[PDB]
């Protein structure tokens, strides 16, 4: 599990955690339509798909500095609503599930040298 080896990886992971935590808070209030998925005209609101888009955009800026490359962005970042996963009996608007894929930025390591002398 190479990922959680260096302490650098751990500190950067904590940094991404606190950054995303202090970032998501602009989705408080908002109002998130989840049945008609059609925000009206003149009312501040967002749709789960729009939220996923926002999250992706965000995760596509801190890349290189906090994350590294996000191989398959279509799968590493997933946002599933409560109703989506749970067959609708036990569903309740407001609950969402976000899951990402942390990949510490690759660092330098050993550089094996094989200098082989000769004449002329």
């Amino acid at each position: 599990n190479a990922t959680f080896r260096d302490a650098s990886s751990r500190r950067l992971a904590a940094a991404t955690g606190v950054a995303l935590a202090e970032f998501l808070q602009q989705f408080n209030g908002l109002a998130v339509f989840t049945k008609n998925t059609n925000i009206r005209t003149g009312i501040i609101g967002t749709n789960p798909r729009l939220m996923l888009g926002k999250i992706r955009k965000w995760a596509q800026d801190n890349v290189g500095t906090l994350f590294s490359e996000f191989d398959n962005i279509n799968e590493d970042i997933q946002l599933l609503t409560d109703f989506e996963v749970q067959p609708k009996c036990v569903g309740q608007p407001g609950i969402f599930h976000l899951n990402m894929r942390y990949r510490p930025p690759v660092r330098g390591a050993r550089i094996n040298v094989n200098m082989a002398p000769a004449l002329f």
Partner: protein
């Protein structure tokens, strides 16, 4: 005067007159533009706040 009182304007299109016996029919044809408003204007699906997070 009504348009000045409420800000609603109509278009004039044509005027026809025609009589019959002792009556004269004076026929205006107006045309009115507007935009229809969605009325449903209901309450929102939820109210956001608290989400969730698993940055495994």
């Amino acid at each position: 005067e009504f348009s000045g009182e409420h800000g609603i304007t109509f278009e004039f299109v044509s005027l026809d007159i025609s009589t019959e016996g002792d009556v004269v029919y004076i026929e205006f044809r107006f045309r009115q533009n507007y935009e229809w408003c969605e009325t449903v204007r209901e309450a929102d699906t939820t109210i956001e706040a608290g989400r969730f997070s698993i940055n495994l």
